[PDB]
Amino acid sequence: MCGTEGPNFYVPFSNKTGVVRSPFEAPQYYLAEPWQFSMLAAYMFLLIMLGFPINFLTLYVTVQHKKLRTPLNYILLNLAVADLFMVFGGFTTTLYTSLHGYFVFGPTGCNLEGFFATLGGEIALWSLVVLAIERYVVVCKPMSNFRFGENHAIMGVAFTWVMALACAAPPLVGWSRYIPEGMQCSCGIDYYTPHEETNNESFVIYMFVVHFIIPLIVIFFCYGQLVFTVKEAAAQQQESATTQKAEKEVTRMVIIMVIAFLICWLPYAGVAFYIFTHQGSCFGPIFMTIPAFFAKTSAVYNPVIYIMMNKQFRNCMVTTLCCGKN
Numbered sequence: 001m002c003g004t005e006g007p008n009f010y011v012p013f014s015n016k017t018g019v020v021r022s023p024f025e026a027p028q029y030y031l032a033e034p035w036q037f038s039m040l041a042a043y044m045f046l047l048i049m050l051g052f053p054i055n056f057l058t059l060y061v062t063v064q065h066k067k068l069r070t071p072l073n074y075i076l077l078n079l080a081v082a083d084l085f086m087v088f089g090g091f092t093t094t095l096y097t098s099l100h101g102y103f104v105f106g107p108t109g110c111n112l113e114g115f116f117a118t119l120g121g122e123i124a125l126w127s128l129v130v131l132a133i134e135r136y137v138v139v140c141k142p143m144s145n146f147r148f149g150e151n152h153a154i155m156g157v158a159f160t161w162v163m164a165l166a167c168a169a170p171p172l173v174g175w176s177r178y179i180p181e182g183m184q185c186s187c188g189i190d191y192y193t194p195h196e197e198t199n200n201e202s203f204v205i206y207m208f209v210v211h212f213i214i215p216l217i218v219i220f221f222c223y224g225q226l227v228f229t230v231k232e233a234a235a236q237q238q239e240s241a242t243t244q245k246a247e248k249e250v251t252r253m254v255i256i257m258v259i260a261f262l263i264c265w266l267p268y269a270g271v272a273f274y275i276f277t278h279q280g281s282c283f284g285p286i287f288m289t290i291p292a293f294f295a296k297t298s299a300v301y302n303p304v305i306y307i308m309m310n311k312q313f314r315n316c317m318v319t320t321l322c323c324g325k326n
């Protein structure tokens with residue numbers, strides 16, 4: 001008796017006192033104080049104010065600088081669009097619902113907001129995976145006579161969309177479901193109830209293997225092989241000071257990317273491992289949603305790592321922000 005069930009929702013609060021209401025109809029101030037809903041709104045405001053310009057500017061400078069329109073950069077533009085899906089599908093809606101204290105758009109808006117917020121985070125995840133694969137292919141050259149071109153980069157972008165739909169679409173047609181989560185102001189996959197009608201258990205396993213384990217394996221493999229190949233080549237050219245500088249910075253960047261991924265990936269593993277053990281207690285609205293709470297900031301720090309630290313993008317944005325000069 002941890003929460004209150006209803007059609008299309010699970011409020012993580014007991015109704016033994018009779019105060020629980022539908023998250024589609026009335027504010028959830030028994031889950032959190034009104035000022036804590038305000039702080040949730042302030043958090044959404046921070047993410048919008050930093051997340052929209054950085055990701056929009058990534059698209060804008062690509063229009064004003066011909067050198068950026070390389071196939072190896074297509075996936076980075078795909079990343080910037082995905083973050084805009086998170087910013088407008090998720091953060092903007094949540095800022096609005098937050099200030100009402102419940103999901104005022106009803107179960108239909110729940111499926112829309114949940115689909116587009118999940119699709120945005122999914123496209124971003126697989127863009128990082130596809131980028132790791134493309135870089136591994138270009139550097140480690142695992143195919144004897146192969147050249148990465150425009151058509152290959154388009155496949156890579158299309159691949160992220162297929163994988164993203166493979167996660168975000170089934171809950172709209174009866175495999176798992178979208179419900180309000182956490183403080184009930186935004187919607188997502190149901191990892192909270194074993195809704196046997198939609199076979200929630202098998203979707204969690206599918207999400208865990210395909211959309212959680214596999215991305216980590218691919219990112220670690222591709223980048224490990226890449227760092228190995230680069231350190232191998234530099235070892236054969238130690239007379240070149242620039243070759244050694246290039247090896248050092250490639251390694252430093254791979255570490256940063258992998259640390260950035262782990263910072264977003266481990267909290268889910270931690271929370272899930274804590275839920276696998278200790279399979280006895282009730283989980284507050286915050287607990288199973290702490291990883292998602294902090295994973296939202298990836299809409300800001302991913303473009304900072306993959307674009308603002310890209311030597312080309314940086315100079316083009318400086319020139320664009322400086323009205324043409326510098």
Ligand SMILES: *[C@@H]1O[C@H](CO)[C@@H](O[C@@H]2O[C@H](CO)[C@@H](O[C@@H]3O[C@H](CO[C@H]4O[C@H](CO)[C@@H](O)[C@H](O)[C@@H]4O)[C@@H](O)[C@H](O[C@H]4O[C@H](CO)[C@@H](O)[C@H](O)[C@@H]4O)[C@@H]3O)[C@H](O)[C@H]2NC(C)=O)[C@H](O)[C@H]1NC(C)=O
Nearest residue numbers: 004005006007009011014015016017018019020021022023
């Ligand atoms: C968490 O738990 C609470 C408490 O159990 C639930 O809230 C109750 O929900 C029921 C509906 O299922 C409410 O019952 C309905 O109340 C209507 C209004 O009643 C108020 O007004 C009348 C005068 O009009 C007062 O006399 C009364 O004291 C109330 O203040 C009634 O119009 C409804 O009557 C109709 O349905 C019943 C059958 O349920 C028939 O017997 C009637 O003839 C009529 O057809 C009905 O009684 C109840 O008022 C709610 N209580 C509170 C405190 O809100 C939540 O739904 C639950 N949360 C979740 C998410 O499930």
Ligand SMILES: CC(C)[C@H](C(=O)N1CCC2(CC1)Oc1ccccc1O2)c1ccc(Cl)c(Cl)c1
Nearest residue numbers: 121122125204207208211212215264265268272
């Ligand atoms: C992009 C998101 C749609 C997706 C997401 O929301 N997930 C949360 C639920 C999920 C799958 C992943 O996590 C689990 C952990 C343990 C057991 C089952 C699990 O199911 C996600 C989020 C962040 C990262 Cl880092 C990754 Cl790789 C993937």
Ligand SMILES: CCCCCCCCO[C@@H]1O[C@H](CO)[C@@H](O)[C@H](O)[C@H]1O
Nearest residue numbers: 032033034035036038039040042043
């Ligand atoms: C993000 C900021 C972290 C620290 C904030 C701690 C604020 C606690 O502040 C207290 O919270 C109570 C909650 O109902 C209020 O009723 C009290 O009036 C208030 O003093």
Ligand SMILES: CCCCCCCCO[C@@H]1O[C@H](CO)[C@@H](O)[C@H](O)[C@H]1O
Nearest residue numbers: 026027095096097098099100101102
């Ligand atoms: C850009 C942000 C705009 C957000 C507008 C939020 C409007 C909140 O609307 C308020 O919701 C309450 C229920 O929670 C009602 O009781 C109030 O009457 C209503 O004014």
Ligand SMILES: CCCCCCCCO[C@@H]1O[C@H](CO)[C@@H](O)[C@H](O)[C@H]1O
Nearest residue numbers: 117118121124125188189264292295
């Ligand atoms: C390094 C990984 C970059 C992509 C991380 C995207 C974070 C997605 O976060 C997900 O968003 C959904 C909709 O808001 C929520 O329903 C999920 O609970 C949450 O895990």
Ligand SMILES: CCCCCCCCO[C@@H]1O[C@H](CO)[C@@H](O)[C@H](O)[C@H]1O
Nearest residue numbers: 219220221223224227251254255258
């Ligand atoms: C997922 C892939 C992560 C790759 C991280 C590789 C980090 C290697 O880092 C390197 O390891 C060498 C070991 O001799 C050290 O001598 C170097 O100082 C160090 O730069």
Ligand SMILES: CCCCCCCCO[C@@H]1O[C@H](CO)[C@@H](O)[C@H](O)[C@H]1O
Nearest residue numbers: 181182183184185186286289292293
């Ligand atoms: C700094 C400590 C923060 C603890 C995490 C608070 C978790 C509250 O739960 C939150 O509810 C929101 C509205 O439904 C969702 O948008 C968030 O994804 C979810 O984390």
Ligand SMILES: *C(=O)CCCCCCCCCCCCCCC
Nearest residue numbers: 317318319320321322323325326
């Ligand atoms: C060239 O590269 C620089 C051109 C001149 C730009 C100077 C203005 C930058 C100010 C950005 C910071 C605004 C902070 C807003 C606070 C919310």
